[PDB]
Design a protein around this ligand. Structure first.
Ligand SMILES: CCN(c1nc(OC[C@@]23CCCN2C[C@H](F)C3)nc2c(F)c(-c3ccc(F)c4sc(N)c(C#N)c34)c(C(F)(F)F)cc12)[C@H]1CCN(C(=O)OC)C1
Ligand SMILES: Nc1nc2c(ncn2[C@@H]2O[C@H](COP(=O)(O)OP(=O)(O)NP(=O)(O)O)[C@@H](O)[C@H]2O)c(=O)[nH]1
Ligand SMILES: [Mg+2]
Length: 166
């Protein structure tokens, strides 16, 4: 058949989880936006695959069932917004929960600084890049509005999942 990658997009409210997902999957920008899954057949490095993307929403809770559902993700996009310092400060907490339910410090993960089209940046690229380095994961800046970096962000995550097999 065709290889499938289960991706989970996580991060603080309003950082653009839905806009990034809808931009990648449906190819347009939503100005106002529900937890749901989005799927698309794509080409990464010449190989065709199916992406199954969970756009997370709702309440923070740690029931057995919620843990088990997140545990089915194979890679995680940890998203903050480059104009929202609190969303960046929360990144450590999201990585902590991923490592906990996946029971591994070697989870395919990408740090995404979204809304890079905005002028009013509060998180310098270099501080997010250095944070990603301390985690050992790539850092990619995106704009769901312009589509800049969006494919690079999700596809790099797939590449991490692939390299994480071997
Ligand atoms: C959509 C829900 N959500 C989430 N908020 C938070 O923390 C919000 C803050 C605000 C202060 C208190 N708290 C602690 C910290 F200070 C940050 N953590 C979340 C989280 F860790 C996950 C998660 C990720 C990966 C995993 F492996 C697992 S496993 C499991 N059981 C998870 C859970 N739950 C989970 C998810 C999930 F699952 F959707 F991906 C959603 C989380 C909203 C709540 C309002 N929010 C906000 O930004 O308010 C300003 C964000
Ligand atoms: N300028 C700009 N705005 C963006 C970008 N990405 C998202 N937004 C805007 O930011 C707001 C929140 O985006 P959304 O995708 O709903 O964020 P979310 O993380 O899904 N929020 P929730 O956690 O409540 O579901 C929306 O008004 C959206 O239009 C971006 O790259 N650039
Ligand atoms: Mg959303």
């Amino acid at each position: 058949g065709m290889t499938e990658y289960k991706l989970v997009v996580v991060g603080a409210d309003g950082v653009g989880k839905s806009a990034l997902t809808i931009q990648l999957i449906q190819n347009h920008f939503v100005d106002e936006y529900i937890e749901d899954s989005y799927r698309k057949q794509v080409v990464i490095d010449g190989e065709t695959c199916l992406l199954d993307i969970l756009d997370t929403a709702g309440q923070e809770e740690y029931s057995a069932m919620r843990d088990q559902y997140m545990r089915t993700g194979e890679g995680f996009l940890c998203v903050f917004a480059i104009n929202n310092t609190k969303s960046f400060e929360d990144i450590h907490h999201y990585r902590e929960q991923i490592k906990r339910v996946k029971d591994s410090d070697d989870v395919p993960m990408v740090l995404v600084g979204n809304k890079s089209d905005l002028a009013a940046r509060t998180v310098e690229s270099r501080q997010a890049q250095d944070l990603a380095r301390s985690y050992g994961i790539p850092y990619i800046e995106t704009s769901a509005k312009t589509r800049q970096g969006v494919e690079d962000a999700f596809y790099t995550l797939v590449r991490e999942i692939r390299q994480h097999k071997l």
